[PDB]
Design a binder for this molecule. Structure first.
Ligand SMILES: *CCC(=O)Nc1cc(Nc2ncc(C(=O)OC(C)C)c(-c3cn(C)c4ccccc34)n2)c(OC)cc1N(C)CCN(C)C
Length: 309
């Protein structure tokens, strides 16, 4: 197989400054900050994840795994890793996505989100995923929470916590134990712990559903442990109010039991692409026409990661 010649950049801790906390939990702490490479007269808005405060050899292993994947991907619809910093704790440094995750975004902006935006996100997520598929990579955790918003017009896939690189000989991926997001995964993933690109397509379907319902919890109520039987019955997520049958049919096709029957990311690009040419024909949102969506501080040597190569 092809040698992976990605560069892993190591960053001095003096080169960046953590300006405010963004979040906290099982993963650690994510800060927003600025990265100023030395003598370069450029200032790059970044997100920085350090591991809580601890050093668990089974956790350091996991952030370094994530670094590995992120360093191996270069695409406008996939999040960019800027580098790692090897201090007390291993720090992951990425491009700041100022509008946060897309689940939270649609929740907060339902009244302002038009069909053009929804369909575009669909194209963009599909484009990222298709790229990942080209790079033989299975994401395994696609959800609206794991898509970040750089601008309302521009989203990127994140969270390579669970991503696995398939061998040129490998067709699926057998996983082990592990906590998993049940409501987003294909039937095979629940029954056999098989994961393919086509299992990601299923997750893509659920992600589209999240967007179209402005951020509903899939199978709200239904406890995790009985989802497998529900799906084998033939039951699926309901048609969201705003969705034409044309759109809902794409979601449904992502949720076929036979994985080869599901759409390919490349196809999804085409389909949504066509729909985003005439959005009002495909999504019915009241007040669609009169809907608009949206500089920080300090100095003006500021350059987005996308323009720092
Ligand atoms: C959905 C929650 C969220 O993401 N909230 C959020 C996010 C961000 N921006 C941002 N930019 C980059 C990254 C990122 O790639 O971080 C890597 C891991 C270094 C993240 C981010 C990634 N994870 C896993 C997070 C968990 C929690 C918080 C952030 C991240 N996030 C901003 O930047 C302005 C704000 C933001 N807000 C404050 C939370 C949403 N509330 C408004 C509801």
């Amino acid at each position: 197989e092809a040698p992976n010649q990605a560069l892993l950049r190591i960053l001095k801790e003096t080169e960046f400054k953590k300006i405010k906390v963004l979040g906290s939990g099982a993963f650690g702490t994510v800060y927003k900050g600025l990265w100023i490479p030395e003598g370069e007269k450029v200032k790059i808005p970044v997100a920085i994840k350090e591991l809580r405060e601890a050093t668990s050899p089974k956790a350091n292993k996991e952030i370094l795994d994530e670094a590995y994947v992120m360093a191996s991907v270069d695409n406008p619809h996939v999040c960019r890793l800027l580098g790692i910093c090897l201090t007390s704790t291993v720090q992951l440094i990425t491009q700041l996505m100022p509008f946060g995750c897309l689940l939270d975004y649609v929740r907060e902006h339902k009244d302002n989100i038009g069909s053009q935006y929804l369909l575009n996100w669909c194209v963009q997520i599909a484009k990222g995923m298709n790229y990942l598929e080209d790079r033989r990579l299975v994401h395994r955790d696609l959800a609206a929470r794991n898509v970040l918003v750089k601008t309302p017009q521009h989203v990127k896939i994140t969270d390579f916590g669970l991503a696995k690189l398939l061998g040129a000989e490998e067709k699926e991926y057998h996983a082990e134990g592990g906590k998993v997001p049940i409501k987003w995964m294909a039937l095979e993933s629940i029954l056999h712990r098989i994961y393919t690109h086509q299992s990601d397509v299923w997750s893509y379907g659920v992600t589209v559903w999240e967007l179209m319902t402005f951020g509903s919890k899939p199978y709200d109520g239904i406890p995790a442990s009985e989802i497998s039987s529900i799906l084998e019955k033939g039951e699926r997520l309901p048609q969201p109010p705003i969705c034409t049958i044309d759109v809902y049919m794409i979601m449904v096709k992502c949720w076929m039991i036979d994985a080869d029957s599901r759409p390919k990311f490349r196809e999804l690009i085409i389909e949504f692409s066509k729909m985003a040419r005439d959005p009002q024909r495909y999504l019915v949102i009241q007040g669609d026409e009169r809907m608009h969506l949206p500089d920080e501080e300090d100095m003006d040597d500021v350059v987005d990661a996308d323009e720092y190569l």
